[PDB]
Symmetry: D2
Subunit: 305 residues, 4 copies
Amino acid sequence: MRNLEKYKGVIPAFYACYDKEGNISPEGVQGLTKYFVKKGVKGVYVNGSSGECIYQSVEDRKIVLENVMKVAEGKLTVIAHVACNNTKDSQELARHAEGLGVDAIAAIPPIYFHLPEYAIAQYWNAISAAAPNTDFVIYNIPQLAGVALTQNLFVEMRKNPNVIGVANSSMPVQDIQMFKQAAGAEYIIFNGPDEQFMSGRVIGAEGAIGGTYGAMPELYLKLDECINAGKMTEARKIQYACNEIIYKMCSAHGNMYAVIKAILKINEGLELGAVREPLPALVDEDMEIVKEAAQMICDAKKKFL
Amino acid sequence: MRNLEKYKGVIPAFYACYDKEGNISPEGVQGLTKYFVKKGVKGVYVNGSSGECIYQSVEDRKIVLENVMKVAEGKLTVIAHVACNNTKDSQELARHAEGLGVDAIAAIPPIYFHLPEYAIAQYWNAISAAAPNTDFVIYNIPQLAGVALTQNLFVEMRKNPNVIGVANSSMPVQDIQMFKQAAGAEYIIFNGPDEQFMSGRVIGAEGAIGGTYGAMPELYLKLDECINAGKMTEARKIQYACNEIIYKMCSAHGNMYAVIKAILKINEGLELGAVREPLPALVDEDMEIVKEAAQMICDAKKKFL
Amino acid sequence: MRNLEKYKGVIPAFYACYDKEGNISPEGVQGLTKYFVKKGVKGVYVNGSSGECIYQSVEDRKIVLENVMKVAEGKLTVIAHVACNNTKDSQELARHAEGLGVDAIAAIPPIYFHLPEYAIAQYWNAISAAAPNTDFVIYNIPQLAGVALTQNLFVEMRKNPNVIGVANSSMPVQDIQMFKQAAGAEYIIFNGPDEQFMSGRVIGAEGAIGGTYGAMPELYLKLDECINAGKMTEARKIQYACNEIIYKMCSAHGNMYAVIKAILKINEGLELGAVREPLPALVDEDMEIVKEAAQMICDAKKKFL
Amino acid sequence: MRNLEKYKGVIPAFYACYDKEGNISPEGVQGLTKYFVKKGVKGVYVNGSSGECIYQSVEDRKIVLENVMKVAEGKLTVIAHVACNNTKDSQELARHAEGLGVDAIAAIPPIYFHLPEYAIAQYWNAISAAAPNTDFVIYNIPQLAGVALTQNLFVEMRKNPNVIGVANSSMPVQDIQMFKQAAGAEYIIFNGPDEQFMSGRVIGAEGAIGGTYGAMPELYLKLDECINAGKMTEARKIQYACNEIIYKMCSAHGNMYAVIKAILKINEGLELGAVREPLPALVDEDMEIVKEAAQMICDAKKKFL
Ligand SMILES: [Mg+2]
Ligand SMILES: [Mg+2]
Ligand SMILES: [Mg+2]
Ligand SMILES: [Mg+2]
């Protein structure tokens, strides 16, 4: 009965867009937003870790979301990741995001220290209470956060009526299946590991949020079309092509998001700036990998679209 | 164009069948083998860890395989897991299995100590050399063995022409995708995590070896039929029903395989005996869980077949 | 040989001192600094994770360090932990700390994302270059940061002449031994795990930085006196009493640092405020644990001093 | 109060002694036993993983212990590690060991599968009941077994009056401290990680069982003498020399125990045979490392004895 159709489809993570001085670029943010509208994705996931949120200030993240919403509002579903190291910064971003009329806010767990489940629930509920009219997505990423969304913690969080589901970036597709089986029809699970897109989708994730989607959004849209059509052979071919490109982008000395920003300059003429330190920048030796990955994306689009 | 069709389908792990004194029961083994023939599964995976191989002697494992082959030969594909703690016992079982005409032998890595990749390759190659006319399957289970089949170790093992692929029991379906992508069309990957059957299958596992399949083989056959037909909604319904049964069986005090042997007595009149210590036996309180799981299996068969 | 005597001894982690509104309290910070001067510890480790640095702004951390330096009167070795999520905030705190004439700056690795060793070295070297006249301590805490100071990364970092050594919070005392053996006499290793103080000290840590020291600094000073005298029976008595107190403080619902601030109100009349969310606050049921731990500290001081 | 003085001191792990055909050598076992008597160690720990027990049959392990007991002449404390993959083989070895009058039997936990604590306790108690008049040592090695001796499981095991303590090979010396603090004076903790010998000893391990001791037993006896005298600087020098030798021995292609057997041929003229496959054998390139480590041991003995 709760309507979650606006979340069903391909929702790329929005990248950090910087100017030449390394500050957030309003023009760069608007340009990348126009790119996502033109590519016909379902939505954008803004100021996630793929958007370098770990490395941004509250003010940086407000400027990014304001500039996304100037272009995207009414055209894309917008999920704003608002978690910060502390609760008060997270509440400030939640209130700001509700003020702009985002569809949902999201939060990773507390990081660095491994906090008990009651403290994790308190953090998410405090963030949710700052945006009390806004859908809330839990982002499960135990490999990086150091704590997991357990089945017991998910039961506790489903007591909050704003919680709509889970963006799952743990590696077991079993976790998707268990969260969806426990929660039932009024919740959505998003597939987080792009390399497993087709496998998380078939086992019950009806949404998909990914850090590599922005490099090749047409391929993930075509993958999703094949899955919805039961064309599993064609879906596998596209998944394998996407994964080969991911492995190529991850083979660079510079960070994978540095590779993606360079690819989008080659393939689209988009200027997204550098990646923020401490993420490592590309070196000269990486430009052959960038060029190869960019061409692999063009070749896969020609093969599959 | 190596022909691996005989490995493509549902291959249950064969359970340990004991008499009342706790020794291997030839009659019990033949009974369980006739059951798998009657259920029309593709093959059986014999003396794996689901068959309590960690807890069996070389002589025990010879008696099991002899009694399986008496019923199964020419009816079922037979894969004999031959790995033991040391190399010489593994070579003895490999030679014995080739002497009986199994389709393939299989091996987990060395366990307990974490041995370097060259020592892992030497162990597998020594086992393969003792069955030099027999297909060889690597069993990847890093969570239990403590070492993984890495992409570099798989490159080295593909130099052995008898290696036909990998039974993958790591949790990431990404591992299935990467092994299949690296190896190509002349290799098969088997899905190991039963809870992820449909997800591993769609991303490129053309076989499936599972410890829970013997409790409910018709449900996994029906799941596989749905997947091959592109009927992903029906596949998901069956996967969810199978996983609910697995979670019920795992809720007991006694070991999951003790629950399955008790279910097979209720549902099929099969007498497989106890589980071998140190695996924990059922307690009286577990029989309500056994009865509930057995009824769940009957109800799923009535719903889905 | 480089003189590191000012770092040898007991250097408590400095706690976050808040007012009733949860902001940094200048008067609270000065109070806690004068407490450490009167207890005769060697120094203080300021704005570490035990000081809630994860949860503090750059401005918060500047206010803390300014108020320490205002009242320390040169009586304390001051190590200022300056690592932030991003490099530019870390460089800002490094420059600020050198401007106040701290003895050393310190840095955990980059967190959340697992960055390659060249990126970790670039982060530390960038922070060090912002305080180019200041001693630099690497803080190794792989359990929380998700990356380790490896032997190869330590070789690279010893190329920077400002690096004086490692605060080691990994659990193996082998790591202390290996870092000390590799580096030699011109470097200092600080023991991080308070529960292993005597064990890390004897195997080559000549310094000690600890989150629990501020609850009971006289006990750690007396432990260190026993170790330096070769009085290992007396040292073990104190270590066991300290560890029992730590286990009692960690038994609370509220965060261990919340327990310590409540203990310091009982035993010292110090008002340090709460802990910052998301760290969980004490509940009513915890005050029995707080009072028991406070009494255990008083009784240990009567037994051992 | 239970007298555990016979367990306090240096107890080397006894190596596997093979003939040229790779079977257990009765003459080789007697020779290595007489070597340990000559070197004046407190005892031997027989058929542990350093003795290649994972790779031995029940019959192999009986032959080893028979030949130790034949020539020890009451001069050594004998701890017989009797754990096997299954319970019945473990019970057979426990009964055999009690029949020879060993001082203690020992057991690692169940391996490969991760069994619940009640199943671990059942395994140890079944082994102990087969040697009901014999002291029992729990061997904690979570890194290899995949399960830990938790504080709760140790409480349960202290209900068995034959349990005398724990050989602790987990890396935190905190685990030694917590086991000793819980158990008190009628129990002994043995330090397992040889690289941490002096640190485990000072925090409350009164015994020490080590796989590298047999390469250089005089150095560990001299280390223990320095610790008992409170001479921590002299102790640290010996610990560092021992650790440098361990790191050299572990730098070979062949397994560390293969390097130690080759060193004992050079330094002592002992013939212990190969290591059992799958442990990797030395290659020609390793003989320079063997000779260097053998010389390092001679040089350390000249410096410290
Ligand atoms: Mg990177
Ligand atoms: Mg069990
Ligand atoms: Mg806490
Ligand atoms: Mg080795």
